[model samples]
Target: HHDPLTGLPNRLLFESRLNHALDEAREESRPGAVLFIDLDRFKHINDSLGHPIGDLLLKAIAERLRDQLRDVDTVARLGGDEFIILLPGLHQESDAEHVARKLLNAFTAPFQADGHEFFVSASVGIALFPKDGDDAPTLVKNADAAMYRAKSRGRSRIEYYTRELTYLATERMALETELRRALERDELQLYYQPKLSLESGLLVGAEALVRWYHPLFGEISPERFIPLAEDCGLILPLGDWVLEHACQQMGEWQKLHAPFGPLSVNLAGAQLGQPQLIERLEQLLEQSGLEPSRLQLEITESFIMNQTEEALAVLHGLKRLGVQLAIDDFGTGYSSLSYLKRLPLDILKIDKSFIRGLPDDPHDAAITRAIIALGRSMQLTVIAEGVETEGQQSFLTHEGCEQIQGFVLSPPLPAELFASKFLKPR
Candidate 1:
C-alpha cells in the first residue's frame, strides 16, 4: 500500500483515501482539491546521476512535500517522480491555491544526495472538488491532463483543471492526427525570409520557415502546430523534411547562379540532440549537391544554456560539418559569458524583443549596443531580427550589426516569389 522508495502511500492507498474523502465532502458539502505533481526533467537527473541518487532525491522531495502541508492532507507517491495530494476541508478555492503555491515554493531549495546538489522543480495540476469532478477517477484524470498542459507549456509551472482544457485536449488530438498526415500529403512548404547585410547592402541569406496548409483548416500557424509536432514526437520527421526541402530549393537556386548566399534553417532542440543529426546533414548536403558552407543552422539560446555540456559537444560536431552555426534569439536566455566564450558559434542573432523599441527606448538601445559590441569583440556576425522601420535598421547599422531580418524589408515569401524578387538576376 506504500511505495518502498519514498515510504509514501501508493496508488491503491491513495485511491482508497480519495474515495473516503469524496464521501465526506459530499456529505458535509465541503470542497477539496487534488493536486497532481510531477517533477520536471526528473528523467534527465536519473539518467545523468543514476537511480540511487534519483531515489534519494525522490525521498527528499517526499519529505519536503509532507512538511509543506497539514497532517490531515494525504501526500501519496504515484511512482516515477509523480506525487498526488488530497487536500480535504478547504474553505475556498484560494485555500487549495495557497497549498499548491507553498508546495511549489518548497522545491526552490536544492536537494542534496550523496554530496551532489540537485535543483529540481515540479509541474502542479489542481482539480478542485465538486467543481472539477465529483468522483475520484475523473478528478485524478482531469488533474493528470492539466499536469500535462503545465509540462507542455514549459515545465515547472501550475495549471488548474478546466472544461476548456478537455476541449483543447480533444482539439489537440485531432490536430496532431491531421499533422501526422500533413507531411505525407505534401501540404508542408518552406517560406524564405531574406536577411539583408547591413554593411554590404546585399542579400546575405534567407531563413527557411516552414508552413503547413491543411485541406480542411486552410493554413495553420506554425506557432500552433510546431509545438504540437514537438509534443507528438513528429519534429524529427518534420525537421528532416524541412532540411531536405530547403537544401533541394537551395540547389535549384545555385544551378541558376542566383547569388542567394546561404540559406538558414532553425534547428529544434530535439533535433540538435540526435546523434544522427550530423550524419543526416552530410547525406542531405551530398544528395542535393549543395555545399555545407551555404547552409546555416540556427539554435535557440535557451536550449544551449539549459544543456550546456551536451549542447557544446553537439555544436562542435556541427562546426566540423563546415556549416555556419548561429545562436538564435540571443538576449532572451540566461547565457553565461563563460559558456558563450567556449561555444563554437559563428553568429549571434539579437532577439526581436530587444529590437521592438530600438533607437528610442534607452534600455533597448543599451542592450542592442551591448549585444552588437559583444558580437564584434567576439568576431561574430550579429544579425538583428524583426527590424520593422528605417530607424530600427539605422540603429542596427550604426551599432555594427551585420544582418537584419523582419517585415521592415519583407515578410517571408514562397520559393517562386522569393526567387523572382530577390534571387533573380539583377
Candidate 2:
C-alpha cells in the first residue's frame, strides 16, 4: 500500500523496483541516481505533540514535493519518515540539483494540515548511478551515508553521495555515543559564574554552567556537545545530570549561606517536553533537600518560541512544581508580550549581545534601556548577563537592573573557586 501521508509507492513497490534496477545494472551497464530523503526535526513536533499533527504535516508537505518532480522521477516511501527518489535517466547532474532546489522551494509555503500550520525540512542524499556505485546495496548505503552528512551539516539541504560519507557519519555517531558515556565517565563538569546583586555587590547566586571534559580533545565547547545532546536525545539525561550536580553543590552552599537563590540552567525546550521533567525535578529537589524556588529553569526566548504554545504549557507546569522560570536571552525573540506575561516566568535575563554593546552603540543602548523598562514594568526580575566592563555594569545598574553576571565579575570557575574568590560578605 502507498503511504497515506506521502501518497508515494510503499516499500513493497520500492524494493520491487530496486531489485529490477539491480538486475538491469548487472545485465547491462546503466547509470542513474538513487536519492535518500529524510525529514529532520519533524518528529520534534509529531512525537512531542501527537501523531495526528505529524501525519497531517507529512501529507501536506509531501503533496507539495510530489508536484515538483519530473514525470520520469520515481518517489517512494521506504518507511515511516523516510522516502526515496529515483531518477532513472538524467543527462546532466544539474537536473537532479534543480529538482532538489524545487523540493526546498515547495516547503516555503507553510504546510496547512488539519487546520494547523506546520513546517518540515529534508536531508537529501544523492548517489550518481555509475560514479557512486553500480549496485542497489552500495547505492542505498552510500546515499544514506550522504544524507546523514547533510543532516549533520544542518538539515534542509542536499548532499551528493561520496565514499567520505561513511567516515563523517561514523564520526558523528561515535561522538554522540561518547557524550552519553561522558556523564558516567566523570567527564561532565560544572563551572560557576558569580551573579552579583547590584544593590549590595554581594554574590547572590553562582550560575552553574556545564562543560564536557573530553579526555582526548581536552575541552570540547558546550556549543559543540549541547546541540549534539539535543539532536541525539541526550539532552534530557545530560540536563538532568547537570541539574542534580548543581543542586548537590547548592545543597552544600545552603548549609553555610543559610539558603540558596535560583541556580540557572539553560534549556532548548526538548528537556521541558520530556514526560517526567516535573516529577524528576521534584524528586531531585526533595532528595537534594533543596527548595523548589531556589532551582530556576532558564529557557531562552528563541528556544521556547521554537515550540510556542507547548512552551507556555511546559512553563506553567514547572510553576506548579514551585519551580521558577526565567525567560533567558530576553528581547531576542518575536514572542508576544501577552504570551510572555502568561508564562510562569519570573525573571528576564537580558541577552548578552545587547548588554555587551550598550552605552556606546546608540541602538544597543536604547534597546537595552527599553528591555530594562519592560522587565521593571512587568515586575520581572531583570538580570544583566555578559557584563564584562565597568561601563556595561554602570549602565545596567543605573538602568535599575537587579542582578549581573559575566567576565567582569569573574569567569566561569570551579564552584569552590567561585565561592572563595567572588563570594563576599554583604
Candidate 3:
C-alpha cells in the first residue's frame, strides 16, 4: 500500500526499492542517487491550517514530484512532509543534480490544494550511491544531514553530502549545549559604552553590551554566539539575564549620579514575542529598584518593521511603564517617516556606517541632515553614533545632532572603571 495522505509509495516501500537500486548500481558499476526532500516551513502551514489541508498539500506535492521524475525513477513519500527519490542508473553526480533542480523548479507555481492556494518550496539533499555510502542506511543518514545543511544555508536549496558540514553540525550542537550552561555558570558579562550629549559634553547614558567567556573556548564573540543563541531559541533567557543585570547595575549607578540619564539595554527582535515581557519588565524594575524612566531599551528599526503590530503593542505597554524606547542603528534599517511618528519612541541613534562618510561625503552629509531635521520635527532626540573624530563631532553639533557616542567619547569600559571615571561621587 501507498502513503494514505499522498498516495505515493511510503517509507517501507521506498527503502525496499532503494536496496534493490543500490544492488543494481553495484552490479552494473554505475552510480545511483538518493534525494532527501523536506518541505520548508510545512509545519507552520500544517499548524496554521488544519491536518486535512496539510494532507491535501502533501498529495499536491506528490503529484508535482511524479510529474518531474523519470518513469524509471521512484519518488516516495516518507511521512511528515519528507520524501525520498531513488534515481537508478545515474551516469554521474550531475545527473542527480539536474533532477534536483527540476524538482525544486516544480514547486515554483502555487499549489491549489482543496481550493486553498499557497506557495511552497523544498530543500534537497543528494547522496550518490557507493560514493556517499555503500549501504542504504548510511546514504539515508548522510542525505538527511545534507538536507539539514541546506536548511541551515536558508532553506529551498540543494546540498550534496560532505564531511565538513557534518563536523560543523557537530560543533553547532556542542556550542548550543555549552551556551545553555553559560548563564548558569555565570560566564556572561555586561560591558557599558557611554553615550555623551553633544552640546553639554555630559555623560547622558551608556548602552549595555554582552560578552561571553566560554570556560573552554576562552572568549567567544557576541556577534557569533548571539546569532547562534537566536537560532537555538536561547535568546529569551539570554535577554532576561541582560535586562535584570542591566537594571540592577543601573540602579547602582543612579545612587552615584542623582540625575542620571537612562541606562540602555539591547533587545533582540525575538525577545518581543515573549508573552510575559511586560510582566518580566515590571518584575525586573521592582527587583532592581530602578525607575522606569531611567531604563532605555535599544532596538534596530528592522526589528520593529519585521513585527510591526507586535512591536507597537509591546512598545505601548513599555511606554505605560515610563521606560524610554530608542531605535538603535536607526538609518541602517527601513525607518518609515510615517511609522517613525507612530512609534512611541524617544531616541534615534544614527548607525555608524552613515557617520563615517559624514561632512566630507556630500551624499552622507545630505542624508544625515535629513535625519536630524526629521528627528527635530518629530520631537525625537537624534544621536549620532561612531563619532570618533573632532571633525565628525563638529559636523554633528553644527547639524543639531542631540547626542554623540563612539570611540570619540570612550570605548565601552568595565563596570568598575566606568563607574569610577564617570559616575558622580557620593
Write down the lDDT of every candidate, Cα atoms only.
0.89, 0.79, 0.86
The predicted structure with the larger lDDT, 2 or 3, is 3
Query: Candidate 3, clashing residue pairs?
Result: none
The collision pairs in model 2 are: none
- By lDDT rank, best first, the candidates go 1, 3, 2
Model 2 lDDT per residue over 1-426, tens place: 787657779877876677677666656665677888898777677767698778877777667667888786778877778888787766676777877777767766777867667667788888877788876778878888988988888878888877788887887788887897886676788998878889788766767889777676678888888888888888878887888888887777766554435687776577777878888889888887888878877888887656666666767788888877888888875877776677767888989999998688898889888988998888988899999999999988888888899999988998767667754433
Displacement of the residue 280 alpha carbon in candidate 2, Å? 2.3
Off by over 4 Å in 2: 1-34, 37-90, 95-123, 129-142, 153-158, 162-167, 184-186, 256-260, 305-317, 423-426
lDDT of 2 at 82: 81
Write down the TM-score of every candidate.
0.70, 0.72, 0.81
lDDT of 3 by residue, 1-426 (tens): 698767899888888888988888888989889999999988778888877887788888899899998889999988788999889877787788898899999989989777769888899988888889988898888888888889788888999999776677667788899999887676789988888997798878888889887767788999989989988789999999899999988887777665547888988887888899998999899877888998999888877766657679888999999999998887775657777788899998888888988779998888888889988898999999888888888899888898989888888888999887778865
Ten residues in a row with the worst lDDT in model 1? 162-171
lDDT at residue 282 of model 1 (Cα atoms): 91
